[model samples]
Target: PTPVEEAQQKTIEAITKAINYMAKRRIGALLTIERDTGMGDYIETGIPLNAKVSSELLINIFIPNTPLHDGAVIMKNNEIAAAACYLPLSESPFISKELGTRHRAAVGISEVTDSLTIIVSEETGGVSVAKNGDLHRELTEEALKEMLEAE
Candidate 1:
């Protein structure tokens, strides 16, 4: 597969792993589907509003286009952003790079595409998610877990 496609696949894998981790922990895991305005409005509107969609919207209507962005078609009914209490990348090698796996992946995606992601900690109610390749601060595993619990 092409590099872009490979990256997209890895991203999907990461997301899936995150979701599974949440589920395994018995946390109320949910995903929201947002569309790509195709105008790169993510740079302006900031990843769209947190609008939830029905299961129908998720399955029949909303579909995630791999490696979204690149000035292609409008990402109708696509999962543009996700919100969860904790990220599932502690075991990744990214922790030593002054960034957690979740943080790195989120930043990486923003750097790569218009897709936006949010990661909330469930332990101490600390929130650390990324948008447009920028974050307010680094997220710690403890803080992330705390925030995850809060949500």
Candidate 2:
């Protein structure tokens, strides 16, 4: 039971710091979600990172003027499972627009297995976390840490 807690301490903390960079930089539709139940079934497959969470790793994955810019980083088991992975449209009837593809998949993860997806909006640098069904958007970075710890 407790081994999982040991893993998340670094994962969540590192992400908050990195996401603050993404938020300020206006990286869009990044930071996808992966369920503890195994997201390999859903993701379209890319280079597996299996990397520990770190600010440099996270920022490097979200490059804006590059080929991998729009990829999804599915963090699971407290490691980044992969990056530059493609996502399938939800089989469900209703969901997001083009830029909100991560939003679509985030809630899809939440709907299926209750994962937390932190979405960074490009237009205004706003951040929100998608829970099983709710959108929690307050001031970010601090709000991001609050949600990470609270979850």
Candidate 3:
């Protein structure tokens, strides 16, 4: 594999680990990883971290009542670029009413960019992913891993 492919695989593993941890703990999280599209403007909306992505860091960020727990975290090049960043909420008429802000925000980001958005619902302990203007909800760990590993 090329260096880029290795890096991408590592990033996928890190993200999967973090998502699993968050879901098990009932921690709500919104993580947006850049793909073909750039999200510099969205990163600028939150506090800059520029730290290596890790499960512990993600869990801490998503811990309830924390300052950075509310908004989305932007990951770029396998690293955490920003936290508590504001993302555009989807205004799609077809969006399900049962979906909350995090789900809508995930879909919104996907609608505008070729990025992957992962959401962990605190209420349901369920995992979801949004891409290409579509949201896939209540995913199992294996399904989530497969989705992340997909090109």
Among the numbered candidates, top TM-score falls to 3
* Number of clashing pairs per prediction, in order: 17, 0, 0
Error of 2 at 4 (Å): 6.2
Q: How do the residues 1-151 of candidate 2 rate in per-residue lDDT, one tens digit apiece?
A: 4878876777787888888887887876457656555678545476777887787888887877776667677877577778877654344444434436666655556666666777777776777776666555646567778778876
Which residue ranges in model 1 land beyond 4 Å of their true spot?
Answer: 1-99, 137-151
Off by over 4 Å in 3: none
Model 1 alpha-carbon miss at residue 142, Å: 23
Q: Against the hidden true structure, what lDDT does model 3 obtain?
A: 0.90
Q: Give the per-residue lDDT digits (tens) of candidate 1, residues 61-124.
A: 2123322211111122323332222222223343336443445545544444444344322332
Q: Residue-wise lDDT of candidate 3 within 1-151, one digit each (tens)?
A: 9998998888878888989988988889999988878899999999999998777788889889989999999998779999999999998866679778999999999999999999998888899989999988889989988988885
Ranking by TM-score: 3, 2, 1
List of clashing residue pairs for candidate 3: none
lDDT values of the candidates?
0.36, 0.69, 0.90
Could you arrange the candidates by lDDT from highest to lowest? 3, 2, 1
Weakest ten-residue segment in model 3 by summed lDDT: 91-100
